[PDB]
Homo-oligomer: A and B are copies of this chain.
Amino acid sequence: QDPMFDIKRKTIEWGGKTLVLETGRIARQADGAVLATMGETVVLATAVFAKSQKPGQDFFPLTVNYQEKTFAAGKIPGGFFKREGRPSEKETLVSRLIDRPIRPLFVKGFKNEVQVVVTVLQHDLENDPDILGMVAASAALCLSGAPFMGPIGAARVGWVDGAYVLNPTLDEMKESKMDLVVAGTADAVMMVESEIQELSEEIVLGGVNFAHQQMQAVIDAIIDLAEHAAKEPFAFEPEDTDAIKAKMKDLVGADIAAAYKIQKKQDRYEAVGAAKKKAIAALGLSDENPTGYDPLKLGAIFKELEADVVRRGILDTGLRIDGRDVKTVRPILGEVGILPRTHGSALFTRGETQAIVVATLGTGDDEQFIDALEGTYKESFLLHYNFPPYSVGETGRMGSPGRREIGHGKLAWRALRPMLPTKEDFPYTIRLVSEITESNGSSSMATVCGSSLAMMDAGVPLVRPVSGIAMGLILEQDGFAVLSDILGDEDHLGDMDFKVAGTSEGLTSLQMDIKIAGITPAIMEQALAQAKEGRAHILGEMNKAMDAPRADVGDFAPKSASDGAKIKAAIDW
Mark A residues whose CB is within 8 Å of B: 1, 3-4, 25-31, 33, 40, 42, 44, 46, 48-50, 63, 65, 67, 69-72, 74-76, 80-83, 85-87, 113-115, 117, 119, 121-124, 331, 333, 339-343, 347, 349, 352, 354, 356, 358-360, 362, 366, 368-369, 382, 384, 388-396, 398-401, 429, 431, 433, 435, 437-440, 554, 556-557
Contacts and interface: CB of A to CB of B under 8 A. Distances in A.
Given A341-B122, A354-B26, A556 B74 contact: yes
Given A341-B124, A399-B86, A431 B1 contact: no
Nearest to A557: B74
A354 B33 CA distance: 14
B71 A342 contact: yes
A74 B343 contact: yes
B29 A366 contact: no
Of A25, A74, A352, A399, most buried by chain B (CB within 10 Å of CB) is: A74
Contacts of A50: 395
A76 B366 contact: yes
A121 B338 CA distance: 10
Contacts of A4: 333, 349
Contact of A438 (B29, B81, B333, B429): B29
B395 A113 contact: yes
Given A40-B340, A49-B395, 13 more contacts: A25-B347, A27-B354, A27-B438, A29-B391, A29-B438, A29-B439, A40-B341, A46-B388, A71-B360, A72-B342, A74-B343, A117-B398, A119-B435
Nearest to A28: B438
- Copies assembled: 3
A366 B82 contact: yes
A27 B437 contact: yes
B368 A87 contact: no
Contacts of A347: 25-26
A71 B433 contact: yes
Contacts of A391: 27, 29-30
A72 B65 CA distance: 35
Contacts of A394: 48
Q: Choose among A82, A114, A435 the residue with the greatest number of B CB atoms under 10 Å from its CB.
A: A82
A90 to B, nearest CB: 13
A556 to B, nearest CB: 5
Contact of A339 (B121, B369, B389): B121
A50 B69 CA distance: 43
A556 B556 CA distance: 48
Given A74-B557, A122-B341, A339-B121, A437 B82 contact: no
Contacts of A554: 74
Given A28-B438, A81-B368, A74 B341 contact: yes
Contacts of A331: 1, 3
A439 B29 CA distance: 8
Nearest to A360: B71
6 contacts: A30-B390, A74-B343, A80-B369, A87-B399, A113-B395, A121-B358
B67 A398 contact: yes
A467 B121 CA distance: 24
B74 A42 contact: no
A325 B44 CA distance: 35
Contacts of A354: 26-28
A71 B431 contact: yes
Contacts of A352: 28-29
B358 A71 contact: yes
Contacts of A433: 69, 71, 83
A166 B401 CA distance: 38
A59 to B, nearest CB: 16
A26 B349 CA distance: 9
A356 B331 CA distance: 58
Centre residue among A30, A31, A117 by max chain B CB count within 10 A: A30
Contacts of A33: 390, 437
B63 A431 contact: no
Given A48-B394, A65-B398, A85-B399, A382 B76 contact: yes
